[PDB]
């Protein structure tokens, strides 16, 4: 069963990451982004209130909601922190959709995010060191440890 293999890889990836190892480069990117997203959401909450609490979405307007936000986020630039913001926004929009019994939108939002990444963020990412550089900058929970020290 391919499901059993996926469960094994998930668990082993997690335990390797706790020791500073990684199952794969992709696994290292995933973990650093999870950590950066947690930290982003903490900082956002303290300055502006929780990201989920301010979102409006209905199935008939879901793309409009997505693009209105993402277009402003990247209107005047791309950088690693704004890429983290983009992921955190998508997560919050999915949580809000589930809260409001609009579960159908989770799959749509995931697709819109992947397409936006492919078309509009990947060019910048490839010119700025790729996801390997993101891991160098954000791995080992680096953004949170920075705030914790100050």
């Amino acid at each position: 069963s391919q499901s059993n293999r996926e469960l094994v890889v998930d668990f082993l990836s997690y335990k390797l990451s706790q020791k500073g190892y990684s199952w794969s480069q992709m696994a290292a990117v995933k973990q650093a982004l999870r950590e950066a997203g947690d930290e982003f959401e903490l900082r956002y909450r303290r300055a502006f209130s929780d990201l989920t609490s301010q979102l409006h979405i209905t199935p008939g307007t879901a793309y409009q909601s997505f693009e209105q936000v993402v277009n402003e986020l990247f209107r005047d630039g791309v950088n690693w922190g704004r890429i983290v913001a983009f992921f955190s926004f998508g997560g919050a929009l999915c949580v809000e959709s589930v809260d409001k019994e609009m579960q159908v939108l989770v799959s749509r939002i995931a697709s819109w995010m992947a397409t936006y990444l492919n078309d509009h963020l990947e060019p910048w990412i490839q010119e700025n060191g790729g996801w390997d550089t993101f891991v160098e900058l954000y791995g080992n929970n680096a953004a949170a440890e920075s705030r914790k020290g100050q």
């Binding site: 409009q64 990247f74 704004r82």
Partner: peptide, 21 residues
């Protein structure tokens, strides 16, 4: 728009958590 203002706030915090070498 309201969602536009969320995008602006995301950019502000994104710039705060942005890291450089």
């Amino acid at each position: 728009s309201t969602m536009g203002q969320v995008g602006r706030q995301l950019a502000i915090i994104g710039d705060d958590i942005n890291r450089r070498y």
